[PDB]
């Protein structure tokens, strides 16, 4: 594992520097390598609402040496600290994404194009009910690759303690 430190008290909150500084550049590095890696929030703290934390940790099973993180994160030094050591340890929790359904309009189209004709209130119950529980979890914005949309992902503990990965570096089914 390699620990990337958010430098505190530098201005902005840790979550925006998580959202637009480390995650975007990591996404490209993770997808271009065919061996997938993983993202862990050691300081993840679910008090009332999520608070990602002050640390991110990049995890795997030599491929991290092929990630070349010294030179892909040299533009945000006055913001992100790159610990050069790559140690291995077992005190890790891996992280999965929780789907937030979709805006009523999005679902309405989907459920009208190939679904039933009459469909009202029950979507306004189902979407809203699941979302509130989902929206309180920790959120990361990510700029799109081929759709041009602002996806607010929602991260949550899994405890799976070993597993496969996605291109964002999280657990998948």
């Amino acid at each position: 594992s390699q620990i990337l430190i958010i430098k505190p008290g530098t201005g902005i909150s840790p979550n925006i520097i998580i959202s637009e500084d480390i995650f975007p550049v990591l996404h490209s590095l993770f997808v271009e390598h065919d061996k997938k890696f993983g993202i862990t929030f050691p300081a993840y703290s679910f008090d009332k609402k999520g608070h990602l934390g002050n640390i991110i940790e990049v995890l795997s099973e030599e491929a991290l040496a092929s990630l070349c993180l010294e030179e892909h994160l040299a533009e945000v030094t006055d913001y992100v600290k790159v610990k050069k050591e790559i140690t291995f340890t077992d005190d890790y929790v891996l992280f999965k994404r929780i789907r937030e359904e979709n805006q009523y309009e999005t679902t309405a189209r989907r459920m009208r194009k190939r679904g039933h004709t009459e469909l009202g209130r029950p979507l306004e119950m189902h979407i809203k009910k699941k979302n509130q529980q989902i929206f309180c979890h920790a959120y990361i914005k990510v700029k799109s690759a081929s759709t041009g949309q602002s996806y607010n992902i929602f991260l949550a503990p899994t405890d799976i303690k070993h597993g496969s990965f996605s291109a964002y570096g999280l657990l998948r089914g």
Binding site: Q132, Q133, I134, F135, C136, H137
Partner: peptide, 13 residues
Amino acid sequence: DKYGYCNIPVGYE
């Protein structure tokens, strides 16, 4: 204990 739950549900309080 009114309806299931077994704890306060996540994100509702």
